[PDB]
Each structure stands twice: as C-alpha cells, then as structure tokens.
C-alpha cells in the first residue's frame, strides 16, 4: 500500500485519458498530492495538478 486515495471525481477525468498515458498522469498526481500534503486525490487536486503540469485546456466556464 503506497498509493494515495483516488476519488471517482478525479478518475472520471482520468478515464478520458488513453490507458498508455493514464499512468503518466496518475503516478504524477500521486507524487503531486503527496508533495502538497494531500492524501486524497480529488477533482480539485487533479485540477491543480493538471494546471501545474500543463493546464493548456481552456474551459473556465463550467457553471
């Protein structure tokens, strides 16, 4: 047991990512959340991680 807690919110976004690059993101976020001090990777954490690694997507209006 050396993995963080992953929520359906974060995984729902990760499920939109091809299986061969899922590990690239998931492992990176695992290290990211630990770095910031978050045991549970949520949608917010994944969001911050994504922006940190490369948040080039533009969808600021979700509502």
Swiss-Prot record:
Family recorded in the similarity comment: Belongs to the ChlB/BchB/BchZ family.
Highest taxon of the lineage: Bacteria
Purpose of the protein: Component of the dark-operative protochlorophyllide reductase (DPOR) that uses Mg-ATP and reduced ferredoxin to reduce ring D of protochlorophyllide (Pchlide) to form chlorophyllide a (Chlide). This reaction is light-independent. The NB-protein (BchN-BchB) is the catalytic component of the complex.
Subunit structure: Protochlorophyllide reductase is composed of three subunits; BchL, BchN and BchB. Forms a heterotetramer of two BchB and two BchN subunits.
Protein name stated in the entry: Light-independent protochlorophyllide reductase subunit B
Residues of the full protein shown: 484 to 537 of 537
């Amino acid at each position: 047991m050396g993995e963080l807690s992953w929520t359906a919110e974060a995984e729902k976004m990760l499920g939109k990512v091809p299986f061969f690059v899922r590990k690239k993101v998931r492992k990176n976020t695992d290290n990211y959340a630990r770095e910031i001090g978050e045991p549970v990777v949520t949608a917010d954490v994944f969001r911050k991680a994504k922006e940190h690694l490369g948040g080039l997507e533009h969808h600021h209006h979700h509502h």
